[PDB]
Amino acid sequence: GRSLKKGPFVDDHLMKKVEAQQGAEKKKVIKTWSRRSTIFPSFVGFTIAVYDGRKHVPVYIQEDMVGHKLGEFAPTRTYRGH
Amino acid sequence: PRKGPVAKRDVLPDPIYNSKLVTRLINRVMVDGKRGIAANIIYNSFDIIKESTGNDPLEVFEQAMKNVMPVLEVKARRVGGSNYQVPVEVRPERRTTLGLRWVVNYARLRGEHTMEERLAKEIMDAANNTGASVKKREDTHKMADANRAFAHY
Amino acid sequence: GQKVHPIGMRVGIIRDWDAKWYAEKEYAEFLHEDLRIRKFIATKLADAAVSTIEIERAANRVNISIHTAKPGMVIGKGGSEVENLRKELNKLTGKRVHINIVEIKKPDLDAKLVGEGIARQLENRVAFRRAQKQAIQRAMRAGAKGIKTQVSGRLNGADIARSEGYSEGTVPLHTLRADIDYAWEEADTTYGKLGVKVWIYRGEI
Amino acid sequence: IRIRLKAYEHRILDQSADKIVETAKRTGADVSGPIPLPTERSLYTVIRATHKYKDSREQFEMRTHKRLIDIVNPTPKTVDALMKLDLPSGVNIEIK
Amino acid sequence: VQYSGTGRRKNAVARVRLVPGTGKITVNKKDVEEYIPHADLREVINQPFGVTETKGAYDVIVNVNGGGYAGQSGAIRHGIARALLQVDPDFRSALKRAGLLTRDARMVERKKPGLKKARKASQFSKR
Amino acid sequence: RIAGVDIPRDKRVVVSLTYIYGIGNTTAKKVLANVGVSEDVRVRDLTNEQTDAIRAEIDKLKVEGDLRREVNLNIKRLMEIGSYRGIRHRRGLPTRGQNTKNNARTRKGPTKTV
Amino acid sequence: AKKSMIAKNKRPAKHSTQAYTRCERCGRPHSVYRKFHLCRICFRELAYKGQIPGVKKASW
RNA sequence: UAGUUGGGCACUCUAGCGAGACUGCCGGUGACAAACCGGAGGAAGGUGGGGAUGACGUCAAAUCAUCAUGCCCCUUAUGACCUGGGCUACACACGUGCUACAAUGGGAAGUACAACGAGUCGCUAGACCGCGAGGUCAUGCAAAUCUCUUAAAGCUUCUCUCAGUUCGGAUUGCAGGCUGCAACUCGCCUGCAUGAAGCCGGAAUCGCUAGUAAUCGCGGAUCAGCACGCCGCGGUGAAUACGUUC
Ligand SMILES: [K+]
Ligand SMILES: [K+]
Ligand SMILES: [K+]
Ligand SMILES: [K+]
Ligand SMILES: [K+]
Ligand SMILES: [K+]
Ligand SMILES: [K+]
Ligand SMILES: [K+]
Ligand SMILES: [K+]
Ligand SMILES: [K+]
Ligand SMILES: [K+]
Ligand SMILES: [Mg+2]
Ligand SMILES: [Mg+2]
Ligand SMILES: [Mg+2]
Ligand SMILES: [Mg+2]
Ligand SMILES: [Mg+2]
Ligand SMILES: [Mg+2]
Ligand SMILES: [Mg+2]
Ligand SMILES: [Mg+2]
Ligand SMILES: [Mg+2]
Ligand SMILES: [Mg+2]
Ligand SMILES: [Mg+2]
Ligand SMILES: [Mg+2]
Ligand SMILES: [Zn+2]
């Protein structure tokens, strides 16, 4: 996977936005196109609207979700069945 | 082919038994050009034959070939709207080929764990005039005799 | 069935490369520089009867041999035209360019020149049969051991395209030692492209 | 001194190699060679058609013929003579 | 004094040298039995002596490289026949009738484009 | 026997250990190396003391219902958080990126010709 | 969109991996030989014309 | 210690020039021809093997998406820029392959033999670290000089004993190595763990006549990274051809 020396990855703009909202009593939805961003404890407790190709699907972060990419929690394509 | 009979490539004699027939046996048992494994299996089987029977394995193998090699085969002929078999004497080249083919195939089908053991058992049975290979020769002769009414073709 | 390009078939057997230079790290750069040079020269000297451009490279220099059946027109008065061409080529390439003009004796035996002539006539709405016939006449009189020509497209603006060709003498395309020149040209007409292919079999090698 | 010659056509390569040997020997320097080196060959396979038709291919090859020349006890004149002797543009020459 | 020879088979090339002796064969500084662990191949190498009736008369030193063991065995056999020619021209007739002088030219046929091997073609489905 | 699973008797000790869940061939070699017991002996030929030493190593290891609970917890964690992988597990489709247009029979199950 | 794509390819890439090769003669993106910076089609065409030094039809 | 060093190119090899193979010579048949059969010699004999080479044409076959192009169409949009997504979907059907179902085998140790090609910020020695993928230091080479690269089948031992297994290697969990700005959609690889179907395959159907089939590896183009595909290379290496009814 992602090599250890490299650290995590998180788009700087997304990381900056979450850090700005850190000092907040109540969190506001963060609209992002950054599928690549990795989830952080700072991300915990927020609602992030991740772009899924055509619209920003909201996702509530939690300590269970940490350690994964945001895009994985926003399915791209819909398949109801046949 | 259409042009006519083609040259038959030759075979050198076996290194230790000095027989072309043993070389042909190695060729038949060989797979994927693994001639080393093939030759080792043949020699192990011959050793087993000499052990379990005091006779020379080469003589035993020749006896098995005599017992298994057919004489009359059946070739299918389509006559108008009816297709049926026709008896045909086997030229000696195809005789040895069929003998080796039957021996190797039925040996591979035997139940013994190792191929050389299977081959040795099959060879000894064929020499004693019994086993699957001898049964195949009997069935071939039986089919030829049954369709013997068509020998004029 | 399809046929190998007559020149490409003999390149390295009896035909030699037009790009007569060697390079390892600069191979791609030199090749693209040659392509741009050839394209620019064709555009610039289109009216001049230019056939072959042989490019050689010696350090920063570039030696360009241009074959033409109108050497005087290409050279200009007192070499004015060739000198202006050298300046333009120096600008385009970024390095010194020596230009050498060559006289195409017997222009009728050049595949590209014959094809260009036929294409010009077709653009002028000459009968394709007559154009090819006179081309073959001139080539044979020049002394070609054989010639072959083909024009394909919407002949006379016909709705259904077809190909009509002519030949005289011998054009043994399968003979490798045979010295056969080949060229393909396009005539743009009111109804689109017409392809003019010419084979000229000269004395074999 | 060591001279490596490379070319796409062995005929012109041999011509240039003979010229180098002739000028050196005339100058009096000792020459060993020419020594043929294993010609490099590269192969390029391209689909003959411009669309689909994968099975029909065509193969082109680029060959680099190479010659080696060794000059021993080179006289002072030989260096300038070899540098003045000009090969065709189709031959690549390397010194030492 | 030594009698030289060159043998070739597939990509294998063998420089053979006969010297009068007991029939010992060494290949690339190792004994024949070590180098060729196949009895059939060793017999193949010794074929020239059998036809020329020179069993044990000459020992062989072979510097061989290229190809595999079977190809190198054929090259050793070819070089031995050539070295025997040098030893005595009269062996030429016997060696020729044995075919040992003939250079086996069966080489690996080149792969063809559009075919998975020299002649094997891709599995074909009509529809 | 060792971890509650009756490993084969006549088989060699390394292979009989592999029959335990959560233990592969490499792990079996490592534990036998720690215990000092030769890998060739059959488990029937193993002495009581060697068996007890093997038991201590395995207990130190994590296997059987413990490992099964752990892996099920991980898979359940994915499914509950609603990851893409969780939905893959829920719908019985390849989770590691394979293409589902063909193949995928291992996850999907037997083919339904409909 | 050939001209726009060619211009975009000519411009410096935003990231290293984004850089990709086109046939500088026709702009074809697929099957571009680094040695010649040409697509297979243009390479075959120019090789036939004999304007690629050294290259010639292979056969053995 | 090593073809190392000296020394020599003799051999091999490399690559220019040549020789050779032409029914040329001999016997027989043949319409005194063409030619055919056999023999000698020779490395090669009747086109020696293979490649390139693809007639006039055929299927309004394929390609307006390589390129070019008449005509028609759009022109603040069918043109242009950006991020993200899709081309990777998945109840199903088909084609082409890879791996298997095992003992002519799996596994452990030791030992032997290639060829074609690629290499500059690229091929990387050697050493050290790491179980491994790889990482660090660092060496030679723009190369018949160094490297990728001690090839795998093979051969010799030891073990496994016919078991859905020590066959099988899917799927899955975990923990990691790389490339890249970035590996979730969606890369490859490694270790641990798990261990799926599969016991040789219905009707039917495919390739191949010899260094071929089969089988074993190796290199290459594309390429930051990524092939069971393609192109090429060599290793080992068979069975069969009675005959032209179908
Ligand atoms: K997929
Ligand atoms: K499929
Ligand atoms: K490209
Ligand atoms: K020579
Ligand atoms: K177009
Ligand atoms: K158009
Ligand atoms: K289909
Ligand atoms: K495949
Ligand atoms: K074994
Ligand atoms: K990915
Ligand atoms: K690669
Ligand atoms: Mg294909
Ligand atoms: Mg092969
Ligand atoms: Mg286990
Ligand atoms: Mg994938
Ligand atoms: Mg790219
Ligand atoms: Mg021909
Ligand atoms: Mg169509
Ligand atoms: Mg258009
Ligand atoms: Mg985009
Ligand atoms: Mg696709
Ligand atoms: Mg079984
Ligand atoms: Mg054939
Ligand atoms: Zn192009």
Description:
This is part of a larger assembly, with seven protein chains of seven kinds. With 205 residues, chain C is of the alpha+beta class. Chain C is built from six helices and seven strands, in the order H-H-E-E-H-H-E-H-H-E-E-E-E. Chain C has helices spanning 6-10, 27-44, 71-75, 80-93, 111-123, 128-142, and strands at residues 50-58, 61-68, 97-103, 146-153, 162-169, 180-189, 192-201. The two termini of chain C are 27 Å apart. Chain D is α+β, with helices and mostly antiparallel strands and 96 residues long. Chain D is built from two helices and four strands; from the N terminus they run βαββαβ. Chain E contains four helices and five strands; from the N terminus they run E-E-E-E-H-H-E-H-H. Chain E has helices at 32-35, 39-52, 69-87, 91-98, and strands at 3-9, 12-20, 25-27, 30-31, 58-65. In chain E, helix 2 runs parallel beside helix 3. Chain E is elongated and about 70 Å long. The relative contact order of chain E is 0.22. The interface between C and G is medium-sized, with 23 and 18 residues. Strand 3 of chain D pairs antiparallel with strand 3 (55-57) of chain G. Bound molecules: potassium ion (11 copies), magnesium ion (MG) (12 copies) and zinc ion. One magnesium ion (MG) binds at residues 18, 20-21, 23-24 of chain F. One potassium ion (K) binds at residues 20-21, 29, 32 of chain G. Chain E binds one RNA strand of 246 nucleotides through strand 2, strand 5 and helix 3. The PDB classes it as ribosome.
Descriptors:
part of a larger assembly; 7 chains; A: 82 residues; alpha+beta; three-stranded mixed β-sheet; 1 helix; 3 strands; G: 60 residues; two-stranded antiparallel ribbon; 2 helices; 32% helix; 12% strand; elongated; binds potassium ion; binds magnesium ion; binds zinc ion; RNA-binding
Question: What is the number of helical segments of chain C per DSSP (H or I, 4+ residues)?
Answer: 6
- Given helix and strand content, the structural type of chain D is alpha+beta
Strand order of the largest sheet of chain D: 2-3-1-4
The number of helices of chain D is: 2
Instruction: Write the H/E string of chain C, N to C.
Output: HHEEHHEHHEEEE
Element order of chain D: H for helix, E for strand: EHEEHE
Family (chain B): Belongs to the universal ribosomal protein uS7 family.
InterPro entries (chain B): Ribosomal_uS7 (IPR000235), Ribosomal_uS7_bac/org-type (IPR005717), Ribosomal_uS7_CS (IPR020606), Ribosomal_uS7_dom (IPR023798), Ribosomal_uS7_dom_sf (IPR036823)
Pfam family, one (chain B): Ribosomal_S7
GO biological process, one term (chain B): translation
Briefly say what this structure is.
This is part of a larger assembly, with 7 protein chains of 7 kinds. Chain A has one helix at 12-22; strands at residues 30-32, 47-51, 56-60.
